[PDB]
Amino acid sequence: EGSPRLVLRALENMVRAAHTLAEIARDNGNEEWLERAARLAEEVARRAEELAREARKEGNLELALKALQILVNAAYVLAEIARDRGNEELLEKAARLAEEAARQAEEIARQARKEGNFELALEALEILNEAARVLARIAHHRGNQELLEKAWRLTHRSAKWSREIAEQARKEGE
Amino acid sequence: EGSPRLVLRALENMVRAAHTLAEIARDNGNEEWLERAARLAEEVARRAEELAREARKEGNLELALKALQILVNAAYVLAEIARDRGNEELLEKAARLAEEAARQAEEIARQARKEGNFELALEALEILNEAARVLARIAHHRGNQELLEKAWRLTHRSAKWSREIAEQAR
Amino acid sequence: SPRLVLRALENMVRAAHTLAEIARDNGNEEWLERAARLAEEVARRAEELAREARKEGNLELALKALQILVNAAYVLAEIARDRGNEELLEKAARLAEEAARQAEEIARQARKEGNFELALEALEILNEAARVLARIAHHRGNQELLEKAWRLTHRSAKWSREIAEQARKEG
Predict the structure, then answer these.
(1) Which one of A114, B17, B35, C98 is least enclosed by Cβ atoms within 10 Å?
(2) E strand or H helix at C28, and its extent?
(3) Is B86 helix (H, G, I), strand (E, B) or coil?
(4) Residue B26 CB coordination number (10 Å)
(5) Cβ separation B47–A171 shorter than 8 A
(6) According to DSSP H, which parts of chain C are helical?
């Protein structure tokens, strides 16, 4: 018996370090230190994909969303490491990681809106913002109009489906 | 009845969306997208101001202050868009929204300070920082020194009254 | 009420941060010194609240007092870089170095005591402190302190991974 919330909170610390490591390597022109930072971010993305995968099978979608957030943040670290280093092969893998998190975050948001689970939807709609903000930035440094439009549309679904809940949770006769 | 907790988190997602749209439009130079981003941010400014008014008429000051920061967040997005499009009519509209948030935030701090409710007072003084951060950025992007002194005076008020409450609890 | 004293201190760092932004973006030298004295003030205040709460056994309060210390150390460091003041970079280095120790010490105690939540809460402040020390070492030309902040960040990642394996389900 363990605590998946603690595995979450630990993975939160590892991207913050991977982001800090990439920052230190970048500001000081250390190509070997970029590689050690990129290797750390590659673990978390693989670690975040497993936890989100497992949490989906047991039906706790709140963990799934929080795991997809860490997947998004790791995709942002790997993205800017690939850019400051001319590696377009990582930017593809980084974009497809953020896009998969954006795809799954919409699934949970779409189904939570269908059930009336207002809290799951808003939490999932928060993660769509995080994934869509990263998809747009990554697609900008890659010249992909379609995923840039995808990031634009996803943000509007975050705004519209949240607006529904806001009007749908208004006072009785306001 | 209704759920103000749901209305808040829904409003919070809506500002985050408007902030993202403004960034996506800005980084890609799509002026038509900037209009859509500003239209949504001005929308949330209504909702936040409306709920803040309703929440205070009930005396629910925590909900009110949480609504006032949504104003500051919505007002800050509008200010950044007016910075790009050269739109002077929105800089005026954006500053008046932050001035209104700093207005109500200080009044709730004064009443809570006079009632001994120091937790609420410190939460209200946080929003003066939020509002004055926007007015300072606006005053810089329009060269207005009178508004800098406002933002500086309001930021300085947040620290002065917070230290007073801190030593009251020593 | 130390939770109230803490909450007020988190407000002044936000204030000290904003005043420095107003001063830097508008080049007002009298305002920058004004912001620095507020930043160093909270760092000294937060330093006292941390040891008060730690000698009392309230480690959650001590860590949140340590983040305020890190944030104030960041405010002073950003001011010193934009103003080329080497004596202020030294003060910012002390404050982040102090926070880096206590974050690592509390992490060791809570980890040996099995409190994995505090351990991760203390390890996150290591990132906060090491990230500040890294920028200081860059704008100050010190390779050893840079190398120090680089081990400190790895320790945040390495010790978190172990707790990540200590907390997984047995399947």
Answers:
(1) A114
(2) none
(3) coil
(4) 17
(5) no
(6) 2-25, 29-55, 59-83, 86-112, 116-138, 143-166
Residue in C157, C167, C168 nearest the CB of A18: C157
Rg, chain C, Cα only: 17
A168 sits in which H/E element: helix A145-168
At A35, phi and psi to the nearest 5?
A: -65, -40
Nearest chain A residue to C148, by CA = A24
Distance in angstroms (rounded) separating the CA atoms of residues C87 and A57: 56
The secondary structure of residue A31, as a DSSP letter, is: H
Question: Which tokens hold the place of A96?
Answer: 């497809």
Residue C16 contacts residue C38 (beta carbons within 8 Å): yes
How many A/B residue pairs have CB atoms within 8 Å?
81
DSSP state of B116: T
d(CA B137, CA B147): 10
How long, in residues, is chain B?
170
B105 by Cβ neighbours in 10 Å (0-12 / 13-18 / 19+) ranks as buried
In angstroms, rounded to a whole number, what is the distance separating the alpha carbons of residues C154 and C160?
10
Q: Which residues of C touch B (CB under 8 A)?
A: 1-2, 4-5, 7-9, 11-12, 14-16, 18-19, 21-22, 25-26, 31, 38, 45
User: Preceding residues of all breaks in chain B (C to N beyond 2.5 angstroms)?
Assistant: none
- DSSP 8-state assignment for residue C58: -
> Given C134, C163, C168, which is nearest A24 (Cβ)?
C134
Q: Exposed/middle/buried for C79, CB within 10 Å: 0-12, 13-18, 19+?
A: buried
Closest CA to A97 of A48, A145, A58, A146: A48
- This PDB structure is determined at a resolution in Å of 3.0
- CA gap B17, C147 in Å, rounded: 39
Structure tokens at C110: 């809570």
- Closest C-alpha among B23, B67, C53, C147 to residue A24: C147
- Which residue type does B57 have? K
Rounded to the nearest angstrom, the gap between the alpha carbon of residue C29 and the centroid of all alpha carbons in its chain is 26
Nearest by Cα to C78 from C135, C143, C146? C135
Query: Residue A170: which residues within 8 A CB-CB, separation 6 or more?
Result: B2, B7
Distance of CA C138 to the CA centre of its chain: 17
Structure tokens at B154: 């309001």
Whether the CB-CB separation of B53 and B76 falls below 8 Å is answered with no
Q: Under a CB-based contact definition with an 8 Å cutoff, are residues B97 and B78 in contact?
A: yes
Q: For chain B, which chains pass the contact test of at least 3 CB pairs under 8 Å? A: A, C
Where is B9: in which H helix or E strand? helix B4-28
Q: What tokens appear for C93 in the block?
A: 């280095």
**For A128, which residue in chain B has the nearest alpha carbon?**
B17
Structure tokens at B146: 């009178």
For A28, the 3-state DSSP assignment is coil
Cα dihedral B123, B126, B132, B137 sign: negative
